[PDB]
Ligand SMILES: *C(=S)NCCc1ccccc1
């Protein structure tokens with residue numbers, strides 16, 4: 001999978017090691033090799049959540065399968081837990097959109113995963 | 115719902131109250147409490163629309179239901195109105211991608227909305 | 229269509245003419261008028277791919293139709309081609325998510341494409 005975090009937390013508040021840690025914990029959570037996981041963090045954003053500019057995040061996780069009710073709950077506990085621990089973001093000011101991609105609709109290395 | 119605007123309009127052209135205004139207008143438009151609505155504006159982008167770098171916007175609106183033919187036309191009229199009036203972007207240089215998210219595919223507060 | 233590339237390549241590495249070339253190549257790949265094509269490049273991103281911060285990209289292409297097995301393979305070869313030639317990113321460090329949008333789910337000019 002690939003995980004993207006957009007947040008109003010400033011760049012200086014993103015701790016060294018954070019992209020690595022996200023890679024490792026997503027690899028572990030999905031039983032996927034870490035060589036396939038992509039991660040992306042976008043700090044310093046102009047965002048509001050419930051009209052407030054307190055720390056918040058808008059995120060996405062795309063996966064070819066391994067998306068569903070229990071699995072997404074597990075992902076959210078893991079990802080909100082990381083965002084709370086590392087970025088000081090309340091889990092109730094985070095949204096994560098989950099996307100179950102078809103292999104034919106994921107481009108990589110001049111072709112797709114189909 | 116959550117609304118993201120990416121634009122080549124500079125940060126200084128985004129009016130002070132703009133995130134609050136989007137929050138309140140989207141709350142009114144969907145009959146949702148404003149506490150749930152997230153909004154995110156990304157200015158100064160390197161983008162073109164039709165090959166031109168005249169002001170333009172690429173947007174998304176994610177909602178758990180309340181997405182459909184008529185609802186979406188209404189959203190577009192509302193959101194293009196605000197982008198024209200506040201950011202001085204022509205409606206014919208705006209795209210908005212609408213996503214009807216399943217509740218189980220939206221993470222929040224260490225779980226999902228399911 | 230609309231194509232978005234997020235990359236850790238620095239802004240100064242993105243050559244003059246890159247948005248123009250993407251617009252032109254996407255028009256040719258879909259036979260669609262360039263006047264409707266939108267492109268967006270986001271350099272200097274904090275991203276990793278396979279746990280490495282070597283040059284990489286995460287991309288999206290949204291289109292109303294013209295998405296499918298052979299078409300997406302063709303787009304990937306085109307777009308990885310450009311990202312390798314112009315931004316010096318290895319094709320195997322690019323992901324492109326493809327989205328076949330329903331015309332009623334794309335807003336434009338105060339309405340939708342339905
Ligand atoms: C996790 S195994 N990511 C690699 C495959 C992929 C899946 C969805 C979107 C992009 C890349």
Ligand SMILES: *C(=S)NCCc1ccccc1
Nearest residue numbers: 095115146150176177178
């Ligand atoms: C509007 S009520 N937003 C909160 C629920 C939601 C829907 C789609 C994506 C993120 C959050």
Ligand SMILES: *C(=S)NCCc1ccccc1
Nearest residue numbers: 209229260264290291292
């Ligand atoms: C290509 S012809 N783009 C214009 C129509 C479109 C399709 C998907 C998303 C946004 C805009």
